[PDB]
Design a protein around this ligand. Structure first.
Ligand SMILES: CCCCCCCCCCCCCCCCCC(=O)OC[C@H](COP(=O)(O)OCCN)OC(=O)CCCCCCCCCCCCCCCCC
Ligand SMILES: CCCCCCCCCCCCCCCCCC(=O)OC[C@H](COP(=O)(O)OCCN)OC(=O)CCCCCCCCCCCCCCCCC
Ligand SMILES: NC(=O)C1=CN([C@@H]2O[C@H](COP(=O)(O)OP(=O)(O)OC[C@H]3O[C@@H](n4cnc5c(N)ncnc54)[C@H](OP(=O)(O)O)[C@@H]3O)[C@@H](O)[C@H]2O)C=CC1
Ligand code: SF4
Lengths: 318, 183, 263, 123, 70, 153, 108, 89
């Protein structure tokens, strides 16, 4: 009732804020990469940039379908925020099949790229929308296949089960090549420019772009890196607190969300950092990179993992 | 609280409506857009019945791949299409009004085992009786549905997964058998 | 080279006595010598009006109310031809200032709805009384007041009533003013708007149009149902013009087998 | 540049008058056949017969040219104009260079006699 | 028959005829920045004809100045 | 009615919902630049790290309501310039950078040149100079922003 | 009324609100393709769909010990030969005519 | 069994009674397979077994590979022709 509407209020309002401060963070850090001031400031007054240009963006011209694809792109980008946990067992909705949901919504996210090319059509513009679609699905493959080879060690579709399994060691440090290829497949889902031929109502694509940026950052953070995990912290508490109290649960939820947010913030900074340094791809190079060279390595990593679980006892129990 | 009762019959009515909007549409893309609406009404029904896992598999592959496939085809191809005019499609009406009756009633006949041919039909509708759900404490680990599918595809029906490999093999060979023009 | 299809001659005298000599050939860079003040040139008829008027080099004085509606009037004339100075109907001194050096002066100040600031009485008879009292004060030749069709002095409509009132007041205070009454107007019976502006420029400059009321109505008479089905005194013949017809204006298997498709 | 553009031909100079007459003949056929394209392409106000009677009266202008090589340059210039017009290279304000008398009547006092020329000293 | 579609790819117009992705022929327009600087210097002395050369090829202007002053 | 109660005097406008969108138009200003000759690089020297104008928010890197004509407008391009000026949103402005873009300039007596874009587009501020320094261009933009705010459309 | 379902009811309202403020504040008013473009999506489906044949094994990997292993290995090893079919046949590569064929100049 | 039978019968009559394009045939064929699934999965639930769900997870795959095959068949049909006809193949 009131108990949960205040809860979803706090979460929606925090995620809606953080996606808007990313649009400022990208301008600032790319300014200082190239030795410019960029935007004047970043504070509480700092939203009034991203607010002000988000207002003025609704003042240009456009030239029933045109209504629907920005809408479904933004709501597909926004519903995937429940299923990330922010701390142990803290989800906005708890479901045992969270990866199946996360995966189905990475599948739903492709439709706005199709239906955007129909509006104000030309022959060549329609072909360009086809190319953006096909690269989006092509890297969605390797996205899904590595989700499998992560949950081979878990053998559970629950997400807090993954992170509590991850307590002994993160999955990023055995499977470090997997981190590398996920980071590039993660800037492949999105149109980040090493991977951006096919770019080089608009407010919804603009918002949902950065929402997908920070949401695939979340999808990295829980399954490859430690989700909310930083260290053990069993010993520090026995000196600070005497007993469980609302101050103690506050302090632990605080440090867990800090450990999650530092993963998400470093990864998010690395997206903007890989934006600046590199030129973009020919589309033939993009498809060739996805299929001919990276995905045979993906079948190879897929065969070498269960065999390694086979050589020892080491099958994971549900 | 009994607002929350008719939820199945609602989605049945919505599926009727949604297929009426499949077969009566102007553009060829409007029909597939109501088709992905039909897949998601179906996935709501599949969650509703007690199968949470399937609904998300239907989202993954049916508004997943094959949707994108059909949207894609309708983009990069031109297809002439006429409208649902009365002068070209009212001639089909007295056959449709027979075949609706006959195919629906006969599709509701075979769930019964009597031999009267009127007691066969009247067992399809004469079911307003509430099944009683007991708790048995015999199950110890959360073998949900997907675990049992992975146990039956892999041990009891390993050959069906292994013939299935040949079918997906053929789905890779076929489009390269056709659409390449080697040399 | 461009010629004065505007003028009848090269040396012209106005009524008040000033001598005006056209310089050079007609064209953008030349000067016809006339100074014209067009009230309401931000509007829909005045735009075409001082398009034609500043085309040859009459120094057009444009009184403006808003600074942004006037900007596209800068490109219709040469250096020093079109001149902007702000005015309000309320402030006497700006009307006084705008007609100091004009040879001819027209108003098309006409508003079809009441504002919180001006009713029908305020913009049609009383503003015209104001500016035409200034025209009488400075003894400007050739004043022209464009009015509405169906301008009756006493009518159920207040718009048409006050158009008739404005006609009567401007005829009362100035005897030499000319009042022209056009039809409905369709720029892009009704009359095309370039035809109304062509008729008005031919009113502007010659003699023997003085103190003459003009009816400017097109060739053939219509009903509103006929118009929507198509979408789905002295006349023009005084000034040697033929208005354009509204209907003409109204618009204003085997090969595929031998092409290649999959490359 | 190896390949030419679409409707181009190698400019080549005939030694006889009859071959030139055949070439200008085929050329008028090309203009007259492409005349329905120009009304769609350059978005003109008016009718296709006015385009066709203009193409006719622009070949009326050079009907009585005697010298062979002046007919030759005149053919080459006409083919260049066809080349520009049939594509989208000319725009709709340079296509309407060809029709200045049609679009608008400039006003009164087109002078005819010496008096009307002389009142504004030959304009 | 190969059917190629045409597109309107500083100031520069450039026609591309495309059969899918491949360019089969290309045709650069030019002239939208032709301002007649070759004819104007015939009416100006050499001391006055000197700035017409940093007008053209403006990025490396002293070399274009130098070729005329050589 | 029969008579009037209107004043015979009122102060001049110089003598004297929507708002947040105009506050947005002030603090962000995205000119679709028509850099076509010499002055286009001086415009890119605003986008260079020295004379950024990153701070108020002009970014020249590229459907907004201002364009900037900068360089000599030839005979061939005057329809192209007007066609680009036509497909802009209605509360629109234009500033004319350089001396070749207002009153012809260095090439004023050439045959294939438009003697300033006053023959084509209605321009509101002129930034004179043949290569007018990024100093002068930015100062023209500040003058134009004052004009835009005093409009309050 | 749990806390999962207000969210996926409340987001279409957020999208409708951000859309209605846009309708309130805005201004209004076949070419041939290559076989590689069609083939990427047509062939994407049998590689997306073995993944969901792989999804029931990864949940139940403990139960099918030593035996469902070999069944999955053989399943994948039957899929790899169709993969090596398409990468032996250069299926996704798009080609053009930029080579002059490098024929030596022959005289007389 | 109502929702499955209704999708099957109405999708079937949407297949049978078109004359306007070729893609409505494909998508009505796909919704027939959906309609068979909607009956099978509820018989899995009401009988308490996975084996109808076994046939479900197999026929998902066969509907997939069916679409892949048949749309390559259409691109065969379109390569040689120019434009897919309105009346049909
Ligand atoms: C679009 C509809 C497609 C439905 C997708 C189903 C989404 C889903 O995965 O729901 C899972 C969730 C509970 O699933 P579970 O994992 O068992 O939760 C464990 C609790 N500790 O389920 C829930 O908590 C709530 C289910 C939300 C789905 C709403 C669909 C309602 C359809 C109503 C029909 C109205 C027309
Ligand atoms: C253990 C036994 C085996 C030992 C070997 C190790 C194997 C395990 C490692 C697996 C990880 C693989 C990572 C991805 C492989 C990339 C392949 C590649 O880089 O080259 C191939 C490809 C060009 O193909 P080709 O025609 O062969 O080009 C020849 C040019 N040398 O190149 C390309 O097309 C594009 C190249 C750039 C790819 C995109 C770059 C994205 C930028 C992100 C860089 C990382 C950023 C990290 C940020 C945080 C860092 C703190
Ligand atoms: N169908 C038609 O169009 C008909 C129109 N007419 C008359 O012809 C004339 C021009 O026609 P039309 O184009 O339609 O009219 P307009 O659209 O041009 O009327 C608006 C012009 O008149 C100005 N105006 C109105 N009231 C005032 C006021 N208090 N103070 C200052 N300016 C004022 C407006 O100022 P601002 O620029 O600030 O808005 C604007 O310049 C009008 O007088 C009209 O009555 C005659 C018959 C039919
Ligand atoms: S204004 Fe001056 S610097 Fe700029 S383009 Fe023209 S001549 Fe070159």
């Amino acid at each position: 009732m009131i108990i949960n509407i205040v809860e979803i209020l706090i979460f929606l309002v925090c995620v809606l804020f953080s996606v808007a401060y990313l649009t400022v963070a990208e301008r600032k850090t790319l300014a200082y990469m190239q030795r410019r001031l960029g935007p004047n400031f970043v504070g509480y007054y700092g939203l009034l940039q991203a607010f002000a240009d988000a207002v003025k963006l609704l003042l240009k011209e456009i030239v029933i379908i045109l209504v629907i694809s920005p809408l479904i792109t933004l709501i597909t980008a926004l519903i995937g925020w429940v299923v990330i946990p922010l701390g142990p067992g803290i989800t906005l909705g708890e479901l045992n099949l969270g990866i199946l949901f996360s995966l189905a919504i990475g599948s739903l996210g492709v439709f706005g790229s199709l239906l955007s090319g129909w509006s104000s059509n030309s022959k060549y513009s329609l072909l360009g929308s086809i190319r953006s679609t096909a690269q989006l699905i092509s890297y969605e493959l390797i996205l899904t296949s590595i989700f499998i080879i992560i949950i081979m060690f878990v053998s559970s579709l629950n997400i807090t089960t993954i992170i509590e399994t991850q307590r002994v060691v993160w999955y990023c440090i055995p499977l470090l090549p997997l981190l590398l290829i996920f980071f590039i497949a993660s800037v492949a889902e999105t149109a980040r420019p090493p991977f951006d031929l096919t770019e080089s109502p608009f407010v919804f694509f603009f918002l949902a772009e950065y929402s997908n940026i920070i949401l695939i950052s979340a999808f990295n953070g829980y399954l490859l890196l430690g989700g909310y995990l930083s260290f053990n912290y069993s010993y520090l508490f026995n000196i600070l607190f005497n007993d469980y109290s609302y101050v103690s649960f506050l302090f632990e939820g605080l440090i867990n969300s800090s450990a999650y947010a530092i993963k998400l913030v470093f990864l998010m900074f690395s997206f903007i950092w890989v934006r600046a340094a590199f030129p973009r791809f020919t589309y033939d190079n993009l498809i060739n990179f996805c299929w001919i060279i990276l995905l045979p390595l993906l079948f190879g990593i897929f065969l070498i993992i269960p065999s390694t679980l086979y050589i020892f006892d080491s099958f994971p129990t549900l | 609280m009994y607002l929350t009762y008719y939820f199945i019959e609602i989605t049945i009515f919505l599926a009727i409506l949604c297929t009426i909007f499949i077969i009566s549409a102007k553009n060829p893309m409007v029909s597939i857009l109501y088709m992905i609406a039909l897949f998601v009404i179906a996935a709501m029904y599949l969650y509703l019945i007690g199968l949470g896992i399937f609904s998300l598999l239907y989202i993954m592959i049916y508004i997943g791949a094959i949707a994108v496939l059909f949207l894609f085809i309708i983009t990069l191809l031109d297809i002439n299409s006429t409208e649902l005019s009365v002068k070209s499609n009212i001639r089909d009406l007295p056959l449709v009004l027979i075949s609706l009756i006959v195919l629906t009633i006969s599709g509701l006949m075979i769930y019964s085992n009597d031999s009267i041919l009127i007691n066969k039909l009247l067992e399809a509708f004469g079911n307003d009786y509430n099944t009683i759900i007991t708790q048995d404490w015999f199950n110890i680990e959360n073998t949900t549905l997907l675990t049992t599918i992975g146990n039956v595809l892999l041990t009891n029906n390993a050959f069906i997964l292994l013939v299935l490999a040949i079918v997906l093999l053929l789905g890779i060979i076929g489009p390269i058998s056709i659409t390449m023009k080697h040399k | 080279m461009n010629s004065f299809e505007n003028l009848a001659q090269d040396v012209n005298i106005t009524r008040s006595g000033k001598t005006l000599i056209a310089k050079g050939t007609g064209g953008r860079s030349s000067r016809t010598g006339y100074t014209a003040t067009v009230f309401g040139a931000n509007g829909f008829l005045g735009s075409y009006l001082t398009a034609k008027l500043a085309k040859h080099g009459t120094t057009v004085v444009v009184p403006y109310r808003e600074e942004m509606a006037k900007r596209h009037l800068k490109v219709t004339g040469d250096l020093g031809v079109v001149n902007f100075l702000e005015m309000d109907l309320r402030n006497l001194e700006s009307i006084d200032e705008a007609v100091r050096h004009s040879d001819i002066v027209v108003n098309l100040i006409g508003r079809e709805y009441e504002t919180k600031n001006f009713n029908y009485y305020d913009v049609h008879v009383e503003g015209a009384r104001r500016i035409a009292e200034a025209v009488k004060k400075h003894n400007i030749a050739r004043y022209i007041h464009v009015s509405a069709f169906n301008a009756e002095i006493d009518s159920p409509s207040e718009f048409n009533h006050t158009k008739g009132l404005g006609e009567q007041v401007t005829k009362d205070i100035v005897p030499w003013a000319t009042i022209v009454r056009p039809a409905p107007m369709f720029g892009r019976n009704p009359v095309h708007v370039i035809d109304v502006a062509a008729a008005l420029e031919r009113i502007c400059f010659d003699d023997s149009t003085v103190a003459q009321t003009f009816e400017l109505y097109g060739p053939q008479k219509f009903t509103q149902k006929q118009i929507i089905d198509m979408v789905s005194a002295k006349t023009f013949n005084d000034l040697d013009l033929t208005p354009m017809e509204l209907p003409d204006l109204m618009f204003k298997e085997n090969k595929e087998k031998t092409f290649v498709h999959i490359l | 540049a190896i390949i030419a553009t679409a409707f181009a031909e190698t400019v080549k100079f005939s030694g006889s008058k009859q071959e030139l007459q055949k070439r200008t003949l085929a050329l008028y056929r090309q203009f007259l056949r492409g005349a329905p394209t120009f009304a769609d392409l350059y978005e003109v106000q008016f009718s296709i017969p006015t385009i066709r009677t203009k193409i006719r009266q622009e070949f009326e202008r050079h009907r009585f040219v005697d010298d062979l090589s002046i007919q030759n340059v005149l053919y080459a210039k006409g083919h260049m104009e066809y080349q520009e017009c049939i594509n989208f290279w000319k725009q709709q304000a340079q296509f309407l260079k060809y029709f200045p008398e049609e679009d608008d009547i400039q006003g009164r006092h087109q002078p005819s006699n010496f008096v009307d020329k002389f009142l504004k000293n030959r304009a | 028959r190969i059917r190629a579609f045409t597109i309107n790819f500083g100031v520069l117009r450039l026609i591309l005829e495309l059969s899918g992705e491949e360019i089969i022929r290309s045709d650069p327009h030019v002239g939208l920045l032709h301002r007649g600087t070759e004819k104007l210097i015939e009416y100006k002395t050499y001391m006055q004809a000197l700035p017409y050369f940093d007008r053209l090829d403006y990025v490396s202007m002293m070399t274009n100045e130098q070729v005329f002053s050589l | 009615v029969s008579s009037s109660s209107m004043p015979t005097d009122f102060p001049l406008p110089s003598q004297q919902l929507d708002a947040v969108a105009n506050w947005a138009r002030q603090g962000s200003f995205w000119p679709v630049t028509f850099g076509l000759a010499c002055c286009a690089v001086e415009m890119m020297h605003v986008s260079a790290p020295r004379y950024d104008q990153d701070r108020l928010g002009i970014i020249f890197r590229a459907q907004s309501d201002i364009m900037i004509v900068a360089g000599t407008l030839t005979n061939k391009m005057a329809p192209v310039l007007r066609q680009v000026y036509d497909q802009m949103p209605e509360p629109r402005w234009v500033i004319s950078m350089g001396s070749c873009a207002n009153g012809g300039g260095y090439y004023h007596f050439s045959y294939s040149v438009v003697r300033g874009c006053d023959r084509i587009v209605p321009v509101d501020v002129y930034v004179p100079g043949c290569p007018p320094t990024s100093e002068a261009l930015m100062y023209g933009v500040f003058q134009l922003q004052r004009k835009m705010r005093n409009t309050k459309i | 009324m749990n806390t999962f379902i207000i969210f996926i009811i409340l987001i279409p309202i957020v999208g409708f609100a951000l859309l209605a403020v846009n309708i309130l504040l805005a201004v209004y008013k076949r070419l041939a393709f290559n076989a590689a473009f069609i083939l990427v999506a047509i062939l994407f489906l049998p590689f997306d769909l073995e993944i969901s044949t792989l999804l029931p094994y990864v949940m139940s990997i403990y139960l099918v010990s030593n035996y469902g292993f070999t069944i999955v290995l053989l399943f994948l090893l039957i899929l790899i030969i169709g993969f090596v079919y398409e990468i032996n046949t250069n299926a996704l590569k798009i080609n053009k005519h930029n080579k002059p064929n490098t024929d030596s100049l022959i005289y007389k | 069994m109502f929702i499955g039978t209704i999708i099957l019968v109405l999708s079937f009559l949407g297949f049978v009674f078109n004359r306007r394009n070729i893609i409505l045939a494909f998508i009505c064929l796909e919704t027939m397979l959906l309609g068979i699934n909607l009956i099978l999965l509820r018989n899995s639930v009401l009988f308490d077994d996975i084996s109808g769900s076994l046939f479900a997870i197999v026929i998902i795959i066969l509907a997939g590979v069916e679409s892949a095959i048949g749309l390559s068949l259409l691109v065969s049909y379109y390569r040689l022709r120019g434009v897919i006809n309105s009346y049909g193949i």
